[PDB]
Design a binder for these strands. Sequence first.
RNA 1: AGUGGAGCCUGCGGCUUAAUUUGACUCAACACGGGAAACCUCACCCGGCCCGGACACGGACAGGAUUGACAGAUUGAUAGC
Lengths: 120, 30, 73, 249, 73
Amino acid sequence: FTYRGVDLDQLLDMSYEQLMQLYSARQRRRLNRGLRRKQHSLLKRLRKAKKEAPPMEKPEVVKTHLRDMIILPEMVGSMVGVYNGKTFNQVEIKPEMIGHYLGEFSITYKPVKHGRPGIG
Amino acid sequence: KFYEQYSNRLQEVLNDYYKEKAENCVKLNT
Amino acid sequence: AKKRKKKSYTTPKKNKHKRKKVKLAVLKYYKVDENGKISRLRRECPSDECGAGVFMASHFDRHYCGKCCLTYC
Amino acid sequence: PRVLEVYRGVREVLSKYRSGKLPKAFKIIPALSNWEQILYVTEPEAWTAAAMYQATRIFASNLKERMAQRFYNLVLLPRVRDDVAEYKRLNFHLYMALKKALFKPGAWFKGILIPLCESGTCTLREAIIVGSIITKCSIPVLHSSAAMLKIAEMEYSGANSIFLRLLLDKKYALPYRVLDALVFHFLGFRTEKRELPVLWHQCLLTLVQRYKADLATDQKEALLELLRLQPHPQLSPEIRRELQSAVPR
Amino acid sequence: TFPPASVLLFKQKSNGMHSLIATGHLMSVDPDRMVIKRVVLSGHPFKIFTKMAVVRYMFFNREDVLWFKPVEL
RNA sequence: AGUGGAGCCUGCGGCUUAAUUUGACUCAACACGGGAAACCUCACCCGGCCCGGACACGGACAGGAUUGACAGAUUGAUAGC
Ligand SMILES: [Zn+2]
């Protein structure tokens, strides 16, 4: 795996200002603006839940409503439940899915399969 | 009574206000 | 007019959270000697208005008055 | 200086307030020396309804009855009158504020009730909305009777007798001088050619329905003279009934 | 039994006293005469538009409504 | 000059969906609610705290009824509720 010619190890140890240059424009904007309180709380929680785990086992799932959250390289490895208006979706955060938002994983609508029409 | 009627600490709170208004958007910590 | 039936349904709101009643908290402030000397256990607040009588709370590390919001180490 | 930038910031918070923990600078306003200058920067007229409830919640608890009264008179009471005139019914937070304002009854009466009836411009709808809060919250007997005495001595309006009835509706044991003012109040309409509303008769009804035990023969027969000059087809026989079946002392 | 026949109804009270509750006669005797028990389920219209309205408290599930779809209100 | 044919956009049916909030159906139904809806607007859905009168009766309170409260730990939220 490599992201913009940068490896995961480098990414993790990288400066926060240096990521504001190694992302897509939106993400850069967001990081300039700053992470909101809730987001910070979420991140801290994640840090806790990955820390308090057996080395062989996958970490315990953290449930959240924040689908406006951007995935940082620090979240890679963790399992997160994201609310889609009704139900949670337990999502393992992969290295590939950093430059995305948590929202695009838990889909908010059921896909359409058409029933046969009535009196029109 | 009814008819016959008619700073150091401030600067601490002020600095606490800006402290909070910095912690709402972090943009730094790892 | 056509009257409504009124339905039953039972959901218990009998269990509700109330803060604990601390009985006789005045003896914790002062230790009275056998002779008759008064010794104060807690720090007294030296604020603008709440002096001479109002005590500060004993936190695990610090002291805190309960009228003016004064905090220490 | 820099303090002017802090409170100009919270001015934009309280104008868009709905919920949550308020900034700590706002919670220490009655602790200040020059608080009325600070309050003008925050702009109380531009505040949200939800903010107004927690503003009142601050002033009622932080002692100083004189400082509490002047907040209600300048900020809270005008806003109440502003919304009854506009929306015709009162906002929920604004209503909840008035119940919280009764934690200091002295500052409540001297700031909300007495200044409202003294203005004269107080409408019937304004009176019932505020008057219902008196019925909900229990009030100290000394303060209850003190407000009752002023209204009895006051100039007569339709809105005025609503409050007076609701205070008697509480059914506390009354001071004897207050009873003398109340009798003198109603006997002031004994020679009046003006047509009296139904709310006036109901106030006279509630007075006799409860306090028939504390009426002497002199004032008792003076009341029968009042009903003989100012009658009602429905209510006047009931007051006549309640006076005739009364045991004194 | 063959009609016509008088029919009385009694009920055991207390101490063994038969109390006459209902008097009548015997009608036609047949098992084909179907007796139907009714149950009327109340609901509440709380959002009303012209000709179409939203009703609650008649059911509590989703497929409860889907079961009693052919039932005319 | 067009539209009806094409792509797209929007309205109403209809179809889905937890919800796709909504009266009007050949003019006066059809970009009407100034309705360009991320939030608000929002009426709709899935969740969660919170309290909801007066009155009469029975209990607690001055050996505090209750209010307010700095920081920290909690759940999807800087919840002294
Ligand atoms: Zn304090």
